[PDB]
Paper text:
The data presented here imply that AtzH is a decarboxylating, 1,3-dicarboxyurea amidohydrolase. AtzH belongs to NTF2-fold superfamily, which contains 38 protein families, including the AtzH family: DUF3225 (DUF: domain of unknown function).
X-ray diffraction data were collected for both. Analysis with PISA gives an interfacial surface area of almost 3,200 Å2 (or about 29% of the total surface area of the protein). The AtzH active site was sought by examining the X-ray structure. The arginine residues form an extensive hydrogen bonding network with the carbonyl oxygens of 1,3-dicarboxyurea. Tyr22 is positioned within 3 Å of the carbonyl carbon of one of the two terminal carboxylic acids, and Arg46 is within hydrogen-bonding distance of the hydroxyl group of Tyr22. Tyr22 and Arg46 are therefore well positioned to form a catalytic dyad, albeit one of atypical composition.
Author numbering:
A (entry chain A): 1 to 66, 71 to 129
B (entry chain B): 1 to 66, 72 to 96, 99 to 128
């Protein structure tokens, strides 16, 4: 019945708050929170702007070696109690001619909401 | 517990079959199937290699105006009703493509609720 439980209000606001935590950690390079919010599994993956990383271990390892931006559109959708997508467009003044996209899928784990897969890319429109 | 229901094999096989359908439709430009497999909702979105499309209507409208080798595939299912599918692909020898999808079990079957495609060096 997931399609008749879209954007439930407690669920939608919870995922929103975690997304905001993620975005603030990204712009301050708070790697501990960036890692905290990724699902600790070998299945977790991140297709980043410059590389592809498979598994939590690879992602967390990358974060240790790797900033401000404006979000211009956001769609956060929740499906039932335990799953969600968060999609944003963004821009940086450093690269005026490009538009960034970031997609995340989130799952309610027994330690909270975590990102299970993410993809980031910048394109010219 | 959802964490203890990763890649259940019945569920994983369902999602995999639809993903295969999607890939064959993409390579034959079978737009009917490509649209059939996207969630028919205004929330559905596709960040494509060259444009951003919001809502099923925009996506299906784009498909009406529009070969590759898959090099790595990860399909993961969570419980009975949700899944992700991620692939790397190549066609342009200097670039590697990524395609990410999230799938949900709807009352008409498994559908893609969001997707992102991009190519990098």
């Amino acid at each position: 019945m997931l399609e008749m439980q879209i954007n439930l209000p407690e669920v939608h606001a919870e995922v929103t708050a975690q997304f905001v935590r993620y975005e603030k950690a990204l712009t301050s390079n708070d790697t501990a929170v960036l890692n905290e919010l990724f699902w600790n599994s070998p299945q977790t993956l991140r297709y980043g702007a410059t590389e592809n990383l498979y598994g939590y271990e690879a992602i967390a390892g990358f974060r240790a070696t790797r900033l401000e931006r404006e979000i211009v559109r956001t769609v956060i959708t929740t499906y039932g109690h335990d799953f969600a997508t968060a999609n944003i467009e963004f821009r940086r003044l450093s690269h005026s001619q490009l538009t960034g996209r970031q997609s995340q899928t989130w799952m309610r784990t027994s330690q909270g909401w975590r990102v299970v897969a993410a993809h980031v890319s910048l394109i010219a429109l």
